[PDB]
Design a protein around this ligand. Sequence first.
Ligand code: HEC
Ligand code: HEC
Ligand code: HEC
Ligand SMILES: C[C@H](CCC(=O)O)[C@H]1CC[C@H]2[C@@H]3CC[C@@H]4C[C@H](O)CC[C@]4(C)[C@H]3C[C@H](O)[C@]12C
Length: 71
Amino acid sequence: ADDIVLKAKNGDTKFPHKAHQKAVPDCKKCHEKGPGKIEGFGKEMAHGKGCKGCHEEMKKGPTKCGECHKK
Ligand code: HEC
Ligand code: HEC
Ligand code: HEC
Ligand SMILES: C[C@H](CCC(=O)O)[C@H]1CC[C@H]2[C@@H]3CC[C@@H]4C[C@H](O)CC[C@]4(C)[C@H]3C[C@H](O)[C@]12C
Protein backbone atom coordinates (compact mmCIF):
# COMPACT_ATOMS: atom_id res chain seq x y z
CA ALA A 1 0.00 0.00 0.00
CA ASP A 2 0.90 3.65 -0.26
CA ASP A 3 1.67 6.26 2.35
CA ILE A 4 -1.09 8.73 3.11
CA VAL A 5 -1.07 12.52 3.38
CA LEU A 6 -3.55 14.24 5.70
CA LYS A 7 -4.91 17.42 4.11
CA ALA A 8 -4.40 19.85 7.00
CA LYS A 9 -5.26 23.36 5.74
CA ASN A 10 -1.98 24.82 7.04
CA GLY A 11 0.11 22.26 5.14
CA ASP A 12 -0.06 18.57 4.09
CA THR A 13 1.09 16.10 6.76
CA LYS A 14 2.71 12.99 5.37
CA PHE A 15 2.53 9.72 7.34
CA PRO A 16 5.44 7.45 6.29
CA HIS A 17 4.56 3.88 7.25
CA LYS A 18 7.98 2.19 6.80
CA ALA A 19 9.65 4.45 9.40
CA HIS A 20 6.88 3.71 11.83
CA GLN A 21 6.85 -0.08 11.38
CA LYS A 22 10.62 0.06 12.06
CA ALA A 23 10.56 2.46 15.02
CA VAL A 24 7.37 1.24 16.70
CA PRO A 25 7.61 -2.59 16.74
CA ASP A 26 4.70 -2.51 19.17
CA CYS A 27 2.12 -2.60 16.32
CA LYS A 28 -0.81 -2.57 18.74
CA LYS A 29 -0.02 1.11 19.44
CA CYS A 30 -1.98 1.71 16.21
CA HIS A 31 -3.41 -1.60 14.96
CA GLU A 32 -6.21 -3.81 16.38
CA LYS A 33 -7.77 -0.87 18.13
CA GLY A 34 -11.45 -1.06 18.82
CA PRO A 35 -13.92 0.51 16.45
CA GLY A 36 -14.11 4.29 16.20
CA LYS A 37 -10.48 5.12 15.45
CA ILE A 38 -11.09 6.11 11.80
CA GLU A 39 -13.99 8.40 12.70
CA GLY A 40 -12.24 9.62 15.80
CA PHE A 41 -9.06 11.06 14.33
CA GLY A 42 -8.61 14.76 14.01
CA LYS A 43 -6.55 17.76 15.05
CA GLU A 44 -6.98 17.09 18.74
CA MET A 45 -5.76 13.48 18.42
CA ALA A 46 -2.99 14.47 15.98
CA HIS A 47 -1.54 17.04 18.33
CA GLY A 48 -1.98 14.56 21.18
CA LYS A 49 -1.29 10.82 21.36
CA GLY A 50 -2.34 10.33 17.72
CA CYS A 51 0.94 11.79 16.42
CA LYS A 52 2.80 14.49 18.30
CA GLY A 53 2.26 13.04 21.78
CA CYS A 54 3.81 9.73 20.74
CA HIS A 55 6.84 11.50 19.27
CA GLU A 56 7.29 13.30 22.60
CA GLU A 57 6.82 10.17 24.67
CA MET A 58 9.13 7.99 22.55
CA LYS A 59 11.73 10.77 22.35
CA LYS A 60 11.84 10.56 18.56
CA GLY A 61 9.81 11.96 15.60
CA PRO A 62 8.79 15.52 14.56
CA THR A 63 7.35 17.81 17.25
CA LYS A 64 7.60 21.23 15.55
CA CYS A 65 4.81 22.69 13.33
CA GLY A 66 6.93 22.94 10.16
CA GLU A 67 8.34 19.46 10.58
CA CYS A 68 4.91 17.78 10.19
CA HIS A 69 3.11 20.42 8.11
CA LYS A 70 4.54 21.04 4.63
CA LYS A 71 2.94 23.00 1.74
C1 HEC B 1 0.90 4.09 13.83
C2 HEC B 1 1.89 4.92 14.27
C3 HEC B 1 1.27 2.70 13.19
C4 HEC B 1 2.16 1.82 13.65
C5 HEC B 1 3.02 1.96 14.93
C6 HEC B 1 2.19 0.68 12.76
N1 HEC B 1 1.27 0.91 11.73
FE1 HEC B 1 0.88 -0.27 10.19
N2 HEC B 1 -0.33 1.18 9.35
C7 HEC B 1 -0.66 2.35 9.97
C8 HEC B 1 -1.43 3.15 9.05
C9 HEC B 1 -1.99 4.55 9.26
C10 HEC B 1 -1.55 2.35 7.78
C11 HEC B 1 -2.26 2.78 6.50
C12 HEC B 1 -1.47 3.89 5.81
C13 HEC B 1 -0.15 3.44 5.23
O1 HEC B 1 0.77 4.26 5.30
O2 HEC B 1 0.01 2.33 4.69
C14 HEC B 1 -0.85 1.12 8.07
C15 HEC B 1 -0.68 0.08 7.20
C16 HEC B 1 -0.13 -1.14 7.53
C17 HEC B 1 -0.03 -2.24 6.62
C18 HEC B 1 -0.42 -2.19 5.14
C19 HEC B 1 0.83 -1.52 4.52
C20 HEC B 1 1.17 -1.95 3.12
O3 HEC B 1 2.22 -1.45 2.63
O4 HEC B 1 0.43 -2.75 2.47
C21 HEC B 1 0.53 -3.27 7.26
C22 HEC B 1 0.84 -4.66 6.65
C23 HEC B 1 0.80 -2.83 8.61
N3 HEC B 1 0.40 -1.51 8.75
C24 HEC B 1 1.39 -3.57 9.58
C25 HEC B 1 2.07 -3.05 10.66
C26 HEC B 1 2.92 -3.78 11.56
C27 HEC B 1 3.22 -5.29 11.41
C28 HEC B 1 3.37 -2.91 12.48
C29 HEC B 1 4.33 -3.14 13.67
C30 HEC B 1 5.54 -3.66 13.39
C31 HEC B 1 2.80 -1.61 12.19
N4 HEC B 1 2.02 -1.73 11.08
C32 HEC B 1 2.99 -0.43 12.90
C33 HEC B 1 -0.28 2.72 11.23
C34 HEC B 1 0.69 2.13 11.99
C1 HEC C 1 3.99 6.03 18.12
C2 HEC C 1 2.97 5.22 18.47
C3 HEC C 1 3.79 7.01 16.95
C4 HEC C 1 2.66 7.49 16.43
C5 HEC C 1 1.21 7.20 16.93
C6 HEC C 1 3.01 8.36 15.34
N1 HEC C 1 4.37 8.40 15.22
FE1 HEC C 1 5.45 9.36 13.81
N2 HEC C 1 7.15 8.46 14.49
C7 HEC C 1 7.24 7.71 15.64
C8 HEC C 1 8.63 7.36 15.90
C9 HEC C 1 9.21 6.55 17.08
C10 HEC C 1 9.40 8.01 14.78
C11 HEC C 1 10.91 7.98 14.56
C12 HEC C 1 11.19 7.20 13.29
C13 HEC C 1 12.65 7.37 12.94
O1 HEC C 1 13.25 6.40 12.41
O2 HEC C 1 13.22 8.47 13.18
C14 HEC C 1 8.41 8.67 13.96
C15 HEC C 1 8.69 9.38 12.82
C16 HEC C 1 7.82 10.17 12.13
C17 HEC C 1 8.17 10.96 10.96
C18 HEC C 1 9.58 11.09 10.32
C19 HEC C 1 9.98 9.84 9.53
C20 HEC C 1 11.46 9.81 9.21
O3 HEC C 1 11.82 9.42 8.08
O4 HEC C 1 12.30 10.16 10.08
C21 HEC C 1 7.06 11.59 10.58
C22 HEC C 1 6.88 12.57 9.38
C23 HEC C 1 5.98 11.21 11.47
N3 HEC C 1 6.47 10.32 12.41
C24 HEC C 1 4.69 11.66 11.37
C25 HEC C 1 3.66 11.13 12.09
C26 HEC C 1 2.28 11.46 11.94
C27 HEC C 1 1.74 12.49 10.95
C28 HEC C 1 1.58 10.73 12.80
C29 HEC C 1 0.07 10.73 12.98
C30 HEC C 1 -0.69 10.63 11.86
C31 HEC C 1 2.50 9.91 13.54
N4 HEC C 1 3.78 10.17 13.08
C32 HEC C 1 2.14 9.04 14.54
C33 HEC C 1 6.20 7.30 16.42
C34 HEC C 1 4.88 7.58 16.20
C1 HEC D 1 2.96 15.96 13.75
C2 HEC D 1 3.53 15.26 14.76
C3 HEC D 1 2.36 17.37 13.98
C4 HEC D 1 2.87 18.42 14.64
C5 HEC D 1 4.24 18.50 15.34
C6 HEC D 1 1.95 19.53 14.53
N1 HEC D 1 0.86 19.10 13.81
FE1 HEC D 1 -0.80 20.25 13.29
N2 HEC D 1 -1.71 18.52 12.56
C7 HEC D 1 -1.08 17.30 12.40
C8 HEC D 1 -1.98 16.39 11.72
C9 HEC D 1 -1.73 14.95 11.32
C10 HEC D 1 -3.24 17.17 11.50
C11 HEC D 1 -4.51 16.72 10.77
C12 HEC D 1 -5.51 16.07 11.69
C13 HEC D 1 -6.61 15.53 10.81
O1 HEC D 1 -7.74 16.03 10.89
O2 HEC D 1 -6.34 14.67 9.95
C14 HEC D 1 -2.99 18.49 12.04
C15 HEC D 1 -3.88 19.53 12.05
C16 HEC D 1 -3.56 20.87 12.25
C17 HEC D 1 -4.43 22.00 12.05
C18 HEC D 1 -5.90 21.92 11.55
C19 HEC D 1 -5.86 21.74 10.03
C20 HEC D 1 -7.23 21.44 9.46
O3 HEC D 1 -8.19 21.22 10.19
O4 HEC D 1 -7.35 21.41 8.23
C21 HEC D 1 -3.71 23.11 12.31
C22 HEC D 1 -4.18 24.57 12.24
C23 HEC D 1 -2.37 22.71 12.73
N3 HEC D 1 -2.33 21.34 12.67
C24 HEC D 1 -1.33 23.54 13.07
C25 HEC D 1 -0.21 23.16 13.75
C26 HEC D 1 0.72 24.06 14.42
C27 HEC D 1 0.63 25.62 14.44
C28 HEC D 1 1.64 23.29 14.99
C29 HEC D 1 2.83 23.73 15.87
C30 HEC D 1 2.48 24.46 16.95
C31 HEC D 1 1.33 21.90 14.71
N4 HEC D 1 0.21 21.87 13.92
C32 HEC D 1 2.07 20.81 15.09
C33 HEC D 1 0.20 17.00 12.77
C34 HEC D 1 1.08 17.79 13.46
C1 LIG E 1 -5.17 4.59 16.56
C2 LIG E 1 -3.80 5.20 16.19
C3 LIG E 1 -3.02 5.64 17.44
C4 LIG E 1 -3.67 6.85 18.14
C5 LIG E 1 -4.71 6.40 19.17
O1 LIG E 1 -4.38 5.70 20.14
O2 LIG E 1 -5.89 6.73 19.06
C6 LIG E 1 -3.94 6.35 15.15
C7 LIG E 1 -2.53 6.88 14.81
C8 LIG E 1 -2.58 7.40 13.37
C9 LIG E 1 -4.07 7.25 13.01
C10 LIG E 1 -4.40 7.23 11.52
C11 LIG E 1 -3.77 8.43 10.73
C12 LIG E 1 -4.16 8.35 9.23
C13 LIG E 1 -5.70 8.30 9.07
C14 LIG E 1 -6.35 9.66 9.49
C15 LIG E 1 -7.88 9.61 9.26
O3 LIG E 1 -8.52 10.81 9.74
C16 LIG E 1 -8.47 8.44 10.05
C17 LIG E 1 -7.85 7.10 9.70
C18 LIG E 1 -6.31 7.09 9.85
C19 LIG E 1 -5.87 5.81 9.18
C20 LIG E 1 -5.92 7.11 11.32
C21 LIG E 1 -6.47 5.88 12.11
C22 LIG E 1 -6.03 5.85 13.60
O4 LIG E 1 -6.71 6.90 14.26
C23 LIG E 1 -4.51 5.98 13.74
C24 LIG E 1 -3.85 4.73 13.18
